[PDB]
């Protein structure tokens, strides 16, 4: 298989105008579950999730997220009192794991305050990295509970990966298909690719035999139909002809377009 990932995000907003809590799960780029403080229900965001998970799953996790929502509100209260901040501020959490092609795995868990890194977990040293002293105070409390850290490591390395495999099988028709890119060159040379899945794609320009960087890269954008599009541009020297070629790598296939 290609590289896949599972990550769950939580957002807390302290003085919302708009939910004060949101939690969404992804497999790769695909939303799979959603919850917010308005609906107070955990719901599938993909047909192959709804199809494969019984009502007791959604019932159980609905209850857990109602609790997590409260814990998030309280932690947000503590961070703002300590930063001595007034007004609306945000608190975010990201957890998840990757299953790489070679079978190796990664695992990560992080927190953010106003969209900046706050606490980053290290499952190998069983420790927390703090970006400032408010974060340092929390670190010391969290690190004093050894069992919780150990719990975090086990979940990231085993449970997260097992969940990910389960979801991969649920949505294999979606997650494991390949739609190769359509690639053309426009004229300043633009190399355009579209209609491809997965979104991971590598586009670059070469001048003669060396990788040219003076290249302008377009972002990888959703086309709204489940496929993606992107581009990369370079500027042609007006005074000396060169051999320019667009190179595209996508799902183990390399492609060259010479001009």
């Amino acid at each position: 298989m290609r590289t896949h990932s599972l990550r769950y995000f939580r957002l807390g907003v302290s003085d919302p105008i708009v939910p004060e809590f949101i939690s969404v799960g992804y497999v790769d780029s695909h939303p799979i579950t959603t919850y917010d403080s308005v609906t107070r229900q955990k719901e599938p965001r993909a047909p192959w999730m709804a199809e494969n998970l019984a009502p007791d799953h959604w019932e159980r996790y609905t209850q857990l997220l109602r609790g997590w929502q409260q814990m998030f509100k309280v932690e947000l209260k503590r961070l703002q009192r300590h930063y001595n901040h007034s007004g609306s501020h945000t608190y975010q959490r990201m957890i998840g794991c990757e299953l790489l092609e070679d079978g190796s795995t990664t695992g990560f868990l992080q927190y953010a305050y106003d969209g900046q890194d706050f606490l980053i977990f290290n499952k190998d040293t069983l420790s927390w990295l703090a970006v400032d002293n408010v974060a340092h105070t929390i670190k010391q409390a969290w690190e004093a509970n050894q069992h919780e850290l150990l719990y975090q490591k086990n979940w990231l390395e085993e449970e997260c990966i097992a969940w990910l495999k389960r979801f991969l099988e649920y949505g294999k028709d979606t997650l494991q298909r390949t739609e190769p890119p359509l690639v053309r060159v426009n004229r300043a040379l633009f190399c355009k690719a579209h209609g491809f899945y997965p979104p991971e794609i590598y586009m670059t320009w070469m001048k003669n035999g060396e990788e040219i960087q003076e290249i302008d890269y377009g972002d990888i954008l959703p086309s709204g139909d489940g496929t993606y599009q992107a581009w990369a541009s370079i500027e042609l020297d007006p005074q000396s002809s060169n051999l320019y070629s667009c190179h595209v790598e996508h799902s183990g296939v390399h492609m060259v377009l010479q001009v």
Partner: antibody, heavy 109, light 115 residues
Framework: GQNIDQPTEMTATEGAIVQINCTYQ??????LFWYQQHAGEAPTFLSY??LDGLEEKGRFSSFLSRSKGYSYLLLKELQMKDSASYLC??????????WGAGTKLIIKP | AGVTQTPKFQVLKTGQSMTLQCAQD?????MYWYRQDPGMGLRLIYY???????DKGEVPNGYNVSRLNKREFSLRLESAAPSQTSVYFC??????????????FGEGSRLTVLE
């Protein structure tokens, strides 16, 4: 998960050592707890394992093998007050607790 | 004080209503009601993940509950049955979901239901 197994009853001698087994077959794993319950009383927390290994805490030790799906509670230098039931509990993938039927430990003075 | 539940003992005739009380002064978010019967492990009746929500456990039939506030979680027997003869345990934890958090148990309530 599905089930937790621990022996119904164990009898050992004062001063000696006893090892209480707990095997689990569960849907996912988020930790194994041991609780002590004296006859007619509330169970109370003894230990927690989630990664492989042995964790010591006084006369009591706790072992875990995730791959073998078993844990044991080790009691050294047994005293009469260790007479109690010991309850094994596992947290599954959905953070729900599955409880063993308990092991009643009897100490011969 | 920990977890306080009442009554310590109770006799009930078949068909009778009953309410078990439980409070915890540890500012815990999660509370639970279990029953303990000979030859089997604790079975969850109902639980409350945090203030404001409750849900069925493994054996909800015959029972219902109320998370009255953050401290209190009472268990109700609708129409007492002989099979509901048991020892009932209230428990609480700081937060369910937190993987390594232990339960704190109350002293138990011994119920005997007779025809």
């Amino acid at each position: 998960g599905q089930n937790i197994d621990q022996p119904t009853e164990m009898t050992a001698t004062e001063g000696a050592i006893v090892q209480i087994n707990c095997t689990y077959q569960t849907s996912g794993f988020n930790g194994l707890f041991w609780y002590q319950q004296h006859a007619g009383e509330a169970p109370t927390f003894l230990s927690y394992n989630v990664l492989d290994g042995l964790e010591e805490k006084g006369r009591f030790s706790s072992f875990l093998s995730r791959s073998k799906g078993y844990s044991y509670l080790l009691l050294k230098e047994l005293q009469m007050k260790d007479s109690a039931s010991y309850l094994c509990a596992v947290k599954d993938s959905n953070y729900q607790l599955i409880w063993g039927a308990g092991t009643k430990l009897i100490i011969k003075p | 004080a920990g977890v306080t539940q009442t009554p310590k003992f109770q006799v009930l005739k078949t068909g009778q209503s009953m309410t078990l009380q439980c409070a915890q002064d540890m500012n815990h978010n999660s509370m639970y009601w279990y029953r303990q019967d000979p030859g089997m492990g604790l079975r969850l009746i109902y639980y409350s993940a945090s203030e404001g929500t409750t849900d069925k456990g493994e054996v909800p039939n015959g029972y219902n509950v109320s998370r009255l506030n953050k401290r209190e979680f009472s268990l109700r027997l609708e129409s007492a049955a002989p099979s509901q003869t048991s020892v009932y345990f209230c428990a609480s934890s700081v937060w369910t979901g937190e993987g390594s958090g232990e339960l704190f148990f109350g002293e138990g309530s011994r119920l005997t239901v007779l025809e």
